[PDB]
Each structure stands twice: as structure tokens, then as C-alpha cells.
Design a protein around this nucleic acid. Structure first.
Length: 51
DNA sequence: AATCTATCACCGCAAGGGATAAATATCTAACACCGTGCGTGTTGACTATTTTACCTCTGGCGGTGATAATGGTTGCATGTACTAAGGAGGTTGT
């Protein structure tokens, strides 16, 4: 349910997730652990990035 | 604001449905030709485009009739409920 509680912030789509750098990332509901931990490098394997 | 165990379940990851795009084959449409006929051109005779002239329409409006005719029309303002004002005039009072 990481999928439910993320898209509940109306960040439903990958296009703006590109803004969510490790300085202000948390604004979302719940989304508390394995999701939040390391997915940020496989994000860069379909091909996106942060900075 | 970090930790996770233990929810209700999404992912874990097998299957299979539709799709679309390739190739084929059909359709139509765009064109280039041709032929028709119309609105390509000047000229010419017509007759009635316009003007002015003349002879003689339509409608401008001014003018007023006489056997005599010589006491008139007009219908419903409103019917209630109030009550404030002015009007009357005799008089018993100021």
C-alpha cells in the first residue's frame, strides 16, 4: 500500500517525482520504510534522476 | 523521527487477451484530356437610358352650398369604512 498512500498526495505520476530530492522529499502520507529506503537507484534504471 | 511485525492484501511474476500494423487488395478521387456553350470581343442598328423641350396628367388645396331645416342631450362617479375638516345658525353662554 506504499502505492496507495504515495498517489494520495496527488503525486500520482512519475513526471513530477523528479522534484523530490533528499532535502524536502517527505510531504506525502505514511510511506515509511522499504519503498522510501533505496528505490531511488532503480528509478535511474527506467532512467529518471534527482539533484 | 526513528524502529518494525504482522495486517489486509499488491505484488510475485504465470498466463493470455486485444491490438495494430504489416501486406495485400480493394476502393475512390484527382486530374488531364476533350467538348460544349456561354458571356470572349467589336461592331452596328435598334429603341426607347437620359436629358430638355413642349403639350397638356395628377393632385395640390382653397373655397364654401340656401323651398326650408332655430329648447339640447347625457346616463350611471356611488352605495362601503373609516373620520377629519368646513360649513351652517340659533343660542346660552364667554
Amino acid at each position: 500500500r506504499s502505492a496507495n498512500c504515495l498517489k494520495a498526495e496527488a503525486i500520482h505520476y512519475i513526471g513530477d517525482l523528479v522534484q523530490r530530492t533528499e532535502v524536502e522529499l517527505l510531504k506525502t502520507p505514511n510511506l515509511g520504510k522499504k519503498s522510501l529506503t533505496e528505490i531511488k537507484d532503480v528509478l535511474a534504471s527506467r532512467g529518471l534522476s534527482l539533484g
